[PDB]
CSV table of C-alpha atoms (C1' of nucleotides) in Angstrom, one decimal:
chain,number,residue,atom,x,y,z
A,1345,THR,CA,86.7,150.9,102.7
A,1346,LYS,CA,86.9,147.3,103.6
A,1347,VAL,CA,89.6,144.5,103.2
A,1348,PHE,CA,88.7,141.1,101.9
A,1349,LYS,CA,90.7,138.3,103.5
A,1350,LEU,CA,91.6,135.2,101.3
A,1351,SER,CA,92.4,131.6,102.5
A,1352,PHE,CA,93.2,129.0,99.9
A,1353,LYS,CA,93.7,125.3,100.9
A,1354,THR,CA,95.0,124.5,97.4
A,1355,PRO,CA,98.3,125.3,95.6
A,1356,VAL,CA,98.2,128.3,93.6
A,1357,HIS,CA,100.4,129.0,90.5
A,1358,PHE,CA,100.8,132.8,89.8
A,1359,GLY,CA,103.7,133.2,87.2
A,1360,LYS,CA,106.3,135.6,86.0
A,1361,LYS,CA,107.7,134.4,82.8
A,1362,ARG,CA,106.8,130.6,82.5
A,1363,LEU,CA,104.6,127.9,84.2
A,1364,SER,CA,107.4,126.6,86.3
A,1365,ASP,CA,108.0,129.9,88.2
A,1366,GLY,CA,106.3,130.4,91.3
A,1367,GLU,CA,105.3,133.6,93.1
A,1368,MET,CA,103.6,134.5,96.4
A,1369,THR,CA,101.4,137.6,95.7
A,1370,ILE,CA,99.8,139.1,92.6
A,1371,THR,CA,99.6,142.6,91.3
A,1372,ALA,CA,96.6,144.8,90.7
A,1373,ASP,CA,96.6,144.0,86.9
A,1374,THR,CA,95.7,140.5,87.2
A,1375,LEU,CA,93.4,141.3,90.0
A,1376,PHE,CA,91.3,143.7,88.1
A,1377,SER,CA,91.7,141.4,85.0
A,1378,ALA,CA,90.0,138.7,86.9
A,1379,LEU,CA,87.4,140.8,88.2
A,1380,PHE,CA,86.6,142.2,84.7
A,1381,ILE,CA,86.4,138.7,83.3
A,1382,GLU,CA,84.2,137.4,85.9
A,1383,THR,CA,82.0,140.3,85.5
A,1384,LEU,CA,81.7,139.6,81.6
A,1385,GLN,CA,81.1,136.0,82.2
A,1386,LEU,CA,78.5,136.9,84.7
A,1387,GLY,CA,76.9,139.3,82.3
A,1388,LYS,CA,76.4,142.2,84.4
A,1389,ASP,CA,77.7,145.6,83.4
A,1390,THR,CA,81.3,147.1,83.4
A,1391,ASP,CA,80.8,150.7,83.5
A,1392,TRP,CA,80.1,150.9,87.2
A,1393,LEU,CA,83.2,148.7,88.0
A,1394,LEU,CA,85.5,150.4,85.6
A,1395,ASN,CA,86.0,154.1,86.4
A,1396,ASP,CA,84.9,154.3,90.4
A,1397,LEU,CA,86.7,151.5,91.8
A,1398,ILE,CA,90.4,151.4,93.5
A,1399,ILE,CA,92.0,148.3,94.3
A,1400,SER,CA,95.2,147.7,95.9
A,1401,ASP,CA,97.7,144.9,95.5
A,1402,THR,CA,97.3,141.6,97.3
A,1403,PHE,CA,99.7,141.2,100.4
A,1404,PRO,CA,100.1,138.2,102.7
A,1405,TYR,CA,99.1,137.5,106.4
A,1406,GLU,CA,99.7,135.0,108.9
A,1407,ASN,CA,97.9,133.7,112.1
A,1408,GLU,CA,96.9,137.2,113.3
A,1409,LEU,CA,99.4,139.4,111.8
A,1410,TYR,CA,99.0,141.3,108.5
A,1411,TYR,CA,101.8,142.7,106.2
A,1412,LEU,CA,102.6,145.4,103.9
A,1413,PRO,CA,105.4,145.9,101.4
A,1414,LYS,CA,108.7,147.6,102.4
A,1415,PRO,CA,108.8,151.3,101.7
A,1416,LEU,CA,111.5,152.6,99.5
A,1417,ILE,CA,112.6,155.3,101.9
A,1418,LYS,CA,116.2,156.6,102.4
A,1419,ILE,CA,117.2,155.3,105.6
A,1420,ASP,CA,120.3,157.1,106.7
A,1421,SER,CA,122.8,154.9,108.7
A,1422,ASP,CA,125.9,151.3,107.9
A,1423,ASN,CA,124.5,147.8,107.5
A,1424,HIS,CA,122.4,148.1,104.4
A,1425,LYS,CA,122.4,144.2,104.4
A,1426,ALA,CA,119.7,143.0,106.9
A,1427,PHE,CA,117.5,145.5,105.6
A,1428,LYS,CA,117.9,144.7,102.0
A,1429,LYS,CA,117.0,141.2,102.8
A,1430,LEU,CA,113.5,142.3,104.3
A,1431,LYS,CA,110.6,142.4,102.1
A,1432,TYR,CA,107.5,142.9,104.1
A,1433,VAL,CA,107.1,145.0,107.3
A,1434,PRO,CA,104.4,143.6,109.9
A,1435,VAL,CA,101.6,146.4,110.2
A,1436,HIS,CA,102.4,146.7,114.2
A,1437,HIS,CA,105.9,148.1,113.4
A,1438,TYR,CA,105.0,150.2,110.4
A,1439,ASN,CA,105.2,153.6,111.8
A,1440,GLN,CA,108.2,152.4,113.8
A,1441,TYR,CA,109.9,151.5,110.5
A,1442,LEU,CA,109.0,154.8,108.8
A,1443,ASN,CA,110.6,156.8,111.7
A,1444,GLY,CA,113.8,154.7,111.7
A,1445,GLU,CA,113.1,152.8,114.8
A,1446,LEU,CA,113.6,149.4,113.5
A,1447,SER,CA,117.0,147.7,115.0
A,1448,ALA,CA,119.1,145.3,112.9
A,1449,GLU,CA,118.4,142.4,115.6
A,1450,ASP,CA,114.8,143.1,115.4
A,1451,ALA,CA,114.8,143.0,111.7
A,1452,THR,CA,116.7,139.7,111.9
A,1453,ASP,CA,114.0,138.5,114.1
A,1454,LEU,CA,111.1,139.6,111.8
A,1455,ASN,CA,113.1,137.9,108.9
A,1456,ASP,CA,113.2,134.6,111.2
A,1457,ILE,CA,109.6,134.7,111.9
A,1458,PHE,CA,108.2,135.7,108.6
A,1459,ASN,CA,107.5,132.2,107.3
A,1460,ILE,CA,104.0,132.2,105.5
A,1461,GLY,CA,104.5,129.4,102.9
A,1462,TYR,CA,106.9,127.4,100.8
A,1463,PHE,CA,107.6,126.8,97.2
A,1464,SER,CA,107.3,123.5,95.3
A,1465,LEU,CA,107.5,122.0,91.8
A,1466,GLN,CA,105.2,119.3,90.3
A,1467,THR,CA,106.5,117.5,87.3
A,1468,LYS,CA,103.8,116.7,84.7
A,1469,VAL,CA,103.6,115.0,81.3
A,1470,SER,CA,101.4,115.1,78.2
A,1471,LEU,CA,100.7,112.0,76.2
A,1472,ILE,CA,98.3,113.8,73.7
A,1473,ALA,CA,101.2,113.2,71.2
A,1474,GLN,CA,101.8,110.2,68.9
A,1475,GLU,CA,102.7,108.2,72.1
A,1476,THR,CA,99.2,107.1,72.4
A,1477,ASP,CA,99.5,105.2,69.1
A,1478,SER,CA,103.2,105.2,68.0
A,1479,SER,CA,106.8,105.4,69.7
A,1480,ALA,CA,106.8,109.0,70.7
A,1481,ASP,CA,108.4,110.7,73.7
A,1482,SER,CA,106.1,111.8,76.6
A,1483,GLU,CA,106.8,115.3,77.1
A,1484,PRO,CA,107.5,116.2,80.8
A,1485,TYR,CA,106.9,119.9,82.0
A,1486,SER,CA,106.8,121.5,85.2
A,1487,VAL,CA,104.4,124.1,87.0
A,1488,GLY,CA,105.6,126.2,89.9
A,1489,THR,CA,103.2,126.3,92.9
A,1490,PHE,CA,102.9,127.9,96.4
A,1491,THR,CA,101.1,126.7,99.4
A,1492,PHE,CA,100.4,128.4,102.6
A,1493,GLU,CA,100.2,127.2,106.4
A,1494,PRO,CA,96.5,126.5,107.5
A,1495,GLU,CA,96.6,130.0,109.2
A,1496,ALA,CA,97.6,132.2,106.4
A,1497,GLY,CA,96.7,133.8,103.0
A,1498,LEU,CA,96.3,137.0,101.1
A,1499,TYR,CA,94.1,140.3,101.8
A,1500,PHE,CA,93.1,143.1,99.8
A,1501,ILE,CA,92.6,146.7,100.1
A,1502,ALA,CA,89.3,148.2,98.3
A,1503,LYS,CA,87.8,151.7,98.4
A,1504,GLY,CA,84.9,153.4,96.8
A,1505,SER,CA,81.2,154.2,97.2
A,1506,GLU,CA,79.3,151.8,99.0
A,1507,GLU,CA,77.5,150.7,95.8
A,1508,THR,CA,80.6,149.8,94.1
A,1509,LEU,CA,81.8,147.9,97.1
A,1510,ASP,CA,78.4,146.0,97.2
A,1511,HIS,CA,78.9,145.0,93.4
A,1512,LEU,CA,82.6,144.1,94.2
A,1513,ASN,CA,81.4,141.8,96.9
A,1514,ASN,CA,78.7,140.4,94.8
A,1515,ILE,CA,81.7,139.4,92.2
A,1516,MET,CA,83.8,138.1,94.6
A,1517,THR,CA,81.2,135.7,95.7
A,1518,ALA,CA,81.1,134.6,92.2
A,1519,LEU,CA,84.9,134.5,91.7
A,1520,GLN,CA,85.8,132.5,94.7
A,1521,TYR,CA,85.1,129.4,92.4
A,1522,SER,CA,87.1,130.5,89.4
A,1523,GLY,CA,90.7,130.7,90.2
A,1524,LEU,CA,93.0,133.7,90.7
A,1525,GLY,CA,96.3,132.4,89.2
A,1526,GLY,CA,97.7,130.2,86.4
A,1527,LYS,CA,96.6,126.7,85.6
A,1528,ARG,CA,93.0,127.4,87.0
A,1529,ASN,CA,91.5,124.6,85.1
A,1530,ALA,CA,94.3,122.0,86.0
A,1531,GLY,CA,93.4,122.0,89.6
A,1532,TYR,CA,95.0,125.2,91.2
A,1533,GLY,CA,93.8,128.4,92.7
A,1534,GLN,CA,90.4,128.1,94.5
A,1535,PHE,CA,89.9,130.1,97.6
A,1536,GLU,CA,87.2,131.1,100.4
A,1537,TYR,CA,87.1,134.9,101.4
A,1538,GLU,CA,85.8,136.8,104.2
A,1539,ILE,CA,85.3,140.4,104.9
A,1540,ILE,CA,87.1,141.8,107.9
A,1541,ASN,CA,87.6,145.2,109.5
A,1542,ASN,CA,90.9,145.9,111.3
A,1543,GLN,CA,91.2,149.0,113.9
A,1544,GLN,CA,95.0,149.1,113.2
A,1545,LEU,CA,94.8,148.9,109.6
A,1546,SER,CA,92.0,151.5,109.3
A,1547,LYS,CA,94.1,153.8,111.6
A,1548,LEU,CA,97.2,153.3,109.1
A,1549,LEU,CA,95.2,153.8,106.3
A,1550,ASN,CA,93.6,157.3,107.4
A,1551,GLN,CA,96.8,158.8,108.5
A,1552,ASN,CA,98.1,162.1,107.5
A,1553,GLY,CA,101.7,162.8,106.5
A,1554,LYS,CA,103.8,164.3,103.8
A,1555,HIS,CA,105.1,161.4,101.8
A,1556,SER,CA,103.1,158.7,100.1
A,1557,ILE,CA,103.4,154.8,99.9
A,1558,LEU,CA,102.2,153.5,96.6
A,1559,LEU,CA,100.3,150.3,97.3
A,1560,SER,CA,99.2,149.2,93.8
A,1561,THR,CA,100.7,149.2,90.2
A,1562,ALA,CA,100.1,152.4,88.6
A,1563,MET,CA,101.5,154.6,85.9
A,1564,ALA,CA,100.8,158.5,85.6
A,1565,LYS,CA,98.7,159.8,82.6
A,1566,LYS,CA,100.7,161.8,79.9
A,1567,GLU,CA,100.1,165.0,81.1
A,1568,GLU,CA,100.7,164.5,84.8
A,1569,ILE,CA,103.9,162.2,84.7
A,1570,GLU,CA,106.1,165.2,84.3
A,1571,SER,CA,105.0,166.9,87.6
A,1572,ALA,CA,104.9,163.3,89.2
A,1573,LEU,CA,108.5,162.5,89.2
A,1574,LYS,CA,109.7,165.7,91.0
A,1575,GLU,CA,111.0,163.7,93.9
A,1576,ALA,CA,110.4,160.1,93.7
A,1577,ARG,CA,112.0,156.8,94.8
A,1578,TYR,CA,110.6,154.0,92.5
A,1579,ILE,CA,111.4,151.1,90.5
A,1580,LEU,CA,109.7,149.9,87.2
A,1581,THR,CA,108.4,146.7,86.5
A,1582,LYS,CA,107.7,145.3,82.9
A,1583,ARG,CA,104.1,143.4,82.6
A,1584,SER,CA,103.6,141.6,79.4
A,1585,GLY,CA,101.8,138.4,78.5
A,1586,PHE,CA,99.0,137.1,76.1
A,1587,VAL,CA,95.2,137.8,76.1
A,1588,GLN,CA,92.2,135.6,76.5
A,1589,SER,CA,89.7,135.6,73.4
A,1590,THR,CA,90.6,138.7,71.3
A,1591,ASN,CA,91.3,137.2,67.9
A,1592,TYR,CA,91.5,133.7,66.2
A,1593,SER,CA,95.3,132.8,67.1
A,1594,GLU,CA,96.3,133.1,70.7
A,1595,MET,CA,99.7,132.5,69.9
A,1596,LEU,CA,99.7,135.6,67.3
A,1597,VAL,CA,97.8,137.7,70.0
A,1598,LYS,CA,100.0,139.2,72.6
A,1599,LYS,CA,99.6,142.3,74.6
A,1600,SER,CA,101.6,145.4,74.2
A,1601,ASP,CA,104.4,145.6,76.8
A,1602,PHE,CA,103.6,147.9,79.5
A,1603,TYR,CA,105.6,149.5,82.4
A,1604,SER,CA,104.3,150.6,85.6
A,1605,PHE,CA,105.8,151.7,89.0
A,1606,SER,CA,106.0,148.8,91.6
A,1607,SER,CA,104.3,148.6,95.0
A,1608,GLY,CA,106.6,150.2,97.2
A,1609,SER,CA,107.5,153.5,95.6
A,1610,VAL,CA,107.6,156.8,97.3
A,1611,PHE,CA,106.0,160.0,95.6
A,1612,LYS,CA,105.7,163.7,96.7
A,1613,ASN,CA,103.1,164.5,93.9
A,1614,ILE,CA,100.0,162.5,94.0
A,1615,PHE,CA,98.8,161.6,90.6
A,1616,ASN,CA,95.7,160.1,89.4
A,1617,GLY,CA,96.2,156.8,87.1
A,1618,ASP,CA,93.9,155.5,84.4
A,1619,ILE,CA,92.8,152.1,82.8
A,1620,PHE,CA,95.4,152.2,80.1
A,1621,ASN,CA,94.4,150.4,76.8
A,1622,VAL,CA,97.0,148.0,75.7
A,1623,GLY,CA,95.1,146.6,72.4
A,1624,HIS,CA,95.7,146.7,68.7
A,1625,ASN,CA,94.6,144.6,65.9
A,1626,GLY,CA,91.8,143.4,68.3
A,1627,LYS,CA,87.8,143.1,68.2
A,1628,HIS,CA,87.6,144.2,71.8
A,1629,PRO,CA,89.5,146.5,73.9
A,1630,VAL,CA,91.8,145.0,76.5
A,1631,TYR,CA,92.5,146.8,79.8
A,1632,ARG,CA,95.3,147.3,82.4
A,1633,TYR,CA,94.8,148.8,85.8
A,1634,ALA,CA,97.0,151.5,86.8
A,1635,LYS,CA,95.3,153.6,89.6
A,1636,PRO,CA,97.1,154.4,92.6
A,1637,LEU,CA,96.0,153.6,96.4
A,1638,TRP,CA,97.9,155.9,98.6
A,1639,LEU,CA,98.7,155.9,102.5
A,1640,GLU,CA,99.8,159.1,103.8
A,1641,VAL,CA,103.0,158.8,105.9
B,1045,A,C1',90.1,141.4,78.7
B,1046,C,C1',94.4,137.0,84.6
B,1047,G,C1',103.0,135.3,81.5
B,1048,A,C1',97.2,133.3,80.1
B,1049,G,C1',95.6,129.0,76.9
B,1050,A,C1',95.8,123.0,75.2
B,1051,A,C1',98.9,118.6,78.3
B,1052,C,C1',97.2,111.2,82.3
B,1053,A,C1',105.1,111.2,85.7
B,1054,C,C1',103.2,107.8,81.8
B,1055,G,C1',104.6,102.8,79.0
B,1056,U,C1',107.1,97.5,79.3
B,1057,A,C1',108.8,94.0,83.1
B,1058,U,C1',108.3,90.5,90.2
B,1059,G,C1',110.2,88.3,95.8
B,1060,C,C1',112.2,85.2,92.5
B,1061,C,C1',116.6,81.4,92.4
B,1062,G,C1',119.0,76.7,95.2
B,1063,A,C1',118.2,74.5,99.5
B,1064,A,C1',115.3,67.0,103.8
B,1065,G,C1',113.2,69.4,110.4
B,1066,U,C1',117.8,67.0,110.5
B,1067,A,C1',122.0,63.7,113.3
B,1068,U,C1',123.0,61.1,118.1
B,1069,A,C1',121.2,57.9,123.0
B,1070,U,C1',117.0,49.9,124.0
B,1071,A,C1',110.4,52.0,128.3
B,1072,A,C1',115.1,49.5,132.7
B,1073,A,C1',115.8,47.6,137.2
B,1074,U,C1',114.0,44.0,143.0
RNA sequence: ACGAGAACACGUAUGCCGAAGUAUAUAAAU
């Protein structure tokens, strides 16, 4: 169980609905998708890295401090205002939060100190139209990009057998030169990675409790969802989009809509996910990653 | 098998226009 540190140094576009939307972190779906496409391009085998590996979502970090998503636990006060405005809780204070030891003023201070990047829109045009030869409008369009301070970035949580971890490290060595976002070929999204161990993160990841904090985007398989939702606090997130090299027409190929729990849901009955298939009318199967990575407290 | 994929904030035009470095007061007294 290692973590992988990511520093960017170039703006990255991550996207929700259009190109001119900017987003800070990315989900396990696009992460596994990038790993899988990099593997296929490299020509190695996918069986090893399909049904053994567990990937957690990407989360941001700052100078020396790491972050995790806000648990969706019922804190019984009544402000319900400063906490709603909080999105990430530093690791130093995680167990303090889950025991209701976080004060309103401390929450305000954390919100004040949480600057880890800013948003930008760069305007771009496209003269590929008749403009080159005849009177034709240049078509302006915008892309949403997000940048980090020189001491920031994203990090991973990965776990599995050591052989799978070695394969993952190889693939990431390959991948640091492809992208991890949107307009990869337009100049966005190259990174350097580094493997680090953290004593505090390790203790947090190997705790023992009664609840569970979901750190990835997963969906229970058909026969286990019924028992999964006995006592659950969760939010669903729709995940759609097109696919890369499935048929002749990109604009005719579009993945089937899929729904999965978010990255902060709390469950009482642990379930195992699966790599659901979201293909139809296609030559090769298309995958989406739904497999949980729990922390028990 | 990444709400992805194609996509030059791009093309036409200037520091110009008018204005004098002037206007006064002897190289002298013993």
